Each structure stands twice: as C-alpha cells, then as structure tokens.
Amino acid sequence: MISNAKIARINELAAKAKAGVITEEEKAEQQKLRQEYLKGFRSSMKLE
Numbered sequence: 001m002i003s004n005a006k007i008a009r010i011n012e013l014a015a016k017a018k019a020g021v022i023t024e025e026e027k028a029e030q031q032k033l034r035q036e037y038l039k040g041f042r043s044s045m046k047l048e
Helices: 004-019 024-038
Strands: none
Touching: 004 024
C-alpha cells in the first residue's frame, strides 16, 4: 500500500524522470510505488 510520504516520493521521482536525473534505483522504486498506489485505483474518466 501507499501513504502521503510515498506519494511525495513518487512525484519526486517522476520529476527526476521528466528531468532525466533519475537513477536506475530511483526508477525501480518509482515503478513499484506507482503499483502500490494503483492498488484499487480505477480510471474514473472511463469508469474503467
């Protein structure tokens, strides 16, 4: 699961990725935490 602290961590890493300064380790954690966020999260715009 994910908490606000980890959500900030995601936005941190995402910014690192959008910038290009993100390392492989940061990338690995980013992908995982995004899944921790996707737990139960559905696409409201499509009701998917």
